[PDB]
RNA sequence: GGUACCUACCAAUCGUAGCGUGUCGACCAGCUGCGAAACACGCAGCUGGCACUGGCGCUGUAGGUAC
């Protein structure tokens, strides 16, 4: 490729209210051939400026685009609760044209602790053969946090899938589901499945269990 | 007034070929270049293609070079992309867009194309397995028990999960789906709801896999 | 003689016998405004080249023609 639009920084957690700066660099000149969208989860991306200070029409004022050379900055004053996004650069001073890698603005906020819940395998998936335990951590904050599976007491390991959601638009938690799969004889052969999660809003490591 | 609706994703084989179209409303597609952008999941904006006005040129992206071909029908007023010998570096959302008018948003890329998935794997279409996670029997967590559906063993992207046929929306987390190590694709969209009010509401997950064409309706209940 | 004109006036150097002059335009590149317009095409303008166009000013020498 030719030009290469290098972005920076890849997220952020801001505050409402808080003034927020994002900045591509051209690895050459492209003059001011320069684009800024934003793109909300599971959405196509919106046009928020174009010519490296331009604002679009119907683009509210508090999106700024600057240029110093081959820098180029996006500039959020007053950073607002229907900003939360992923914003993308764009160079389209020659063929091919380059994004940058984007930078994913989430909203911060007071700390949340995880719900836990542990739901064992259904009837029907034991007859199939396999059996799947869930355990979900609902609505907490930060995004970071651990869970580790024990059956008996072995600490599983290496065979729990993890998914976590989107930021929440209403209450801006995150939602995080671990899925524990075991054979049908394997799971049988224990009695006590439990799911043990740590995080920052939890002072002791919470157990959540269940007997087969 | 503007809009651009694109159509023809789908699931194809490595090697495979593929044509995605993209029919223009509200503006005639001959007086704006016209562009293809590419976004895998979980990833950055990629531009893959584009077409000039007026004289026909087209550029491509080194990823795409030799393998993609844009074109476009002024008499159906719609830009066409075809992919041969597809990788499975191809399968991303695939997005049409109209590049504004020189004057206003130059070269800036003003209205896009909602999207159109496109899976490049050698695996073959399989309906999801639907199970329930029923409710907590042991206590309920404060008033507030949680149930939800597991939906495994799918491919490919996507499906789609509501619950009591949209009359619950309330409390719903539907996970990303993730690959399992069979190659197939897993998720589980889970509900909170009041406990006291469990036994006389009735929970029902609504799962949707129109690749495989299976639509189930599967019941929760505490046992 | 005079005036006007015709022809010729090494090579190199755009050209000229020589000196000066680089254009109403052509051509090569680059830039800009505009045409629904990144390239291509079209219209208008600018910058640099070039000398296709061999014009214009001045000054001749030789021969010759005509008043
Ligand atoms: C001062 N210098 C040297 C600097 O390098 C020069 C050199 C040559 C030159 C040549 C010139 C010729 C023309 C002009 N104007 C010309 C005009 C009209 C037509 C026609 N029909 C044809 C041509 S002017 C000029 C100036
Ligand atoms: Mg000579
Ligand atoms: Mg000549």
């Known amino acids: 490729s030719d030009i290469q639009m290098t972005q920076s920084p890849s997220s952020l957690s801001a505050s409402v209210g808080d003034r927020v700066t994002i900045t591509c660099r051209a690895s050459?000149?492209?003059?001011?051939?320069v684009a800024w969208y934003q793109q909300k989860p599971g959405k196509a991306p919106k046009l928020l400026i174009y010519?490296?200070?331009s604002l679009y029409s119907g683009v509210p004022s508090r999106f700024s685009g600057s240029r110093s050379g081959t820098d180029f900055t996006l500039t959020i004053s007053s950073l607002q609760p229907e900003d939360f996004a992923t914003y993308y650069c764009?160079?389209?001073?020659?063929?091919?044209?380059?994004f940058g890698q984007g930078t994913k603005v989430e909203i911060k906020r007071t700390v949340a602790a995880p719900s836990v819940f542990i739901f064992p395998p259904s009837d029907e998936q034991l007859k199939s053969g396999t059996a799947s335990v869930v355990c979900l951590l609902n609505n907490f904050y930060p995004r970071e946090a651990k869970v580790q599976w024990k059956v008996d007491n072995a600490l599983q390991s290496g065979n729990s899938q993890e998914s976590v959601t989107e930021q929440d638009s209403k209450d801006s938690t995150y939602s995080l589901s671990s899925t524990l799969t075991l054979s049908k004889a394997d799971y049988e052969k224990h009695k006590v499945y439990a799911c043990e999660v740590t995080h920052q809003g939890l002072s002791s490591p919470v157990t959540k269990s269940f007997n087969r | 007034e503007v809009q651009l609706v694109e159509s023809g994703g789908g699931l194809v084989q490595p090697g495979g070929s593929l044509r995605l179209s993209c029919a223009a409303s509200?503006?005639?597609?001959?007086?704006?270049?016209i562009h293809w952008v590419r976004q895998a999941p979980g990833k950055g904006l990629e531009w893959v293609a584009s077409?000039?006005?007026?004289?026909?040129?087209?550029y491509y992206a080194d990823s795409v070079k030799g393998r993609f071909t844009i074109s476009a029908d002024t008499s159906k007023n719609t830009a066409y992309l075809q992919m041969n010998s597809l990788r499975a570096e191809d399968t991303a959302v695939y997005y049409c867009?109209?590049?504004?008018?020189?004057?206003?948003?130059?070269?800036?890329?003003?209205?896009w194309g909602q999207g159109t998935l496109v899976t490049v794997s050698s695996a073959s279409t399989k309906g999801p397995s639907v199970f329930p996670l029923a409710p907590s029997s042991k206590s309920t967590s404060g008033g507030t028990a949680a149930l939800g559906c597991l939906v495994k063993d799918y491919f490919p992207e996507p499906v789609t999960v509501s619950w009591n046929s949209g009359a619950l929306t309330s409390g719903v987390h539907t996970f990303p789906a993730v690959l399992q190590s069979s190659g197939l694709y897993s998720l589980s969209s889970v509900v909170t709801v009041p406990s006291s009010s469990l036994g006389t509401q009735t929970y029902l997950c609504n799962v949707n896999h129109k690749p495989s064409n299976t639509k189930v309706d599967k019941k929760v209940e505490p046992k």
């Open positions: 867009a109209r590049q504004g008018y020189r004057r206003r948003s130059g070269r800036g890329f003003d209205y």
């Open positions: 077409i000039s006005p007026y004289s026909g040129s087209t």
């Open positions: 050459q000149s492209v003059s001011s051939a």
């Open positions: 764009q160079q389209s001073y020659s063929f091919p044209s380059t």
């Open positions: 010519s490296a200070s």
């Open positions: 509200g503006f005639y597609i001959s007086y704006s270049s």
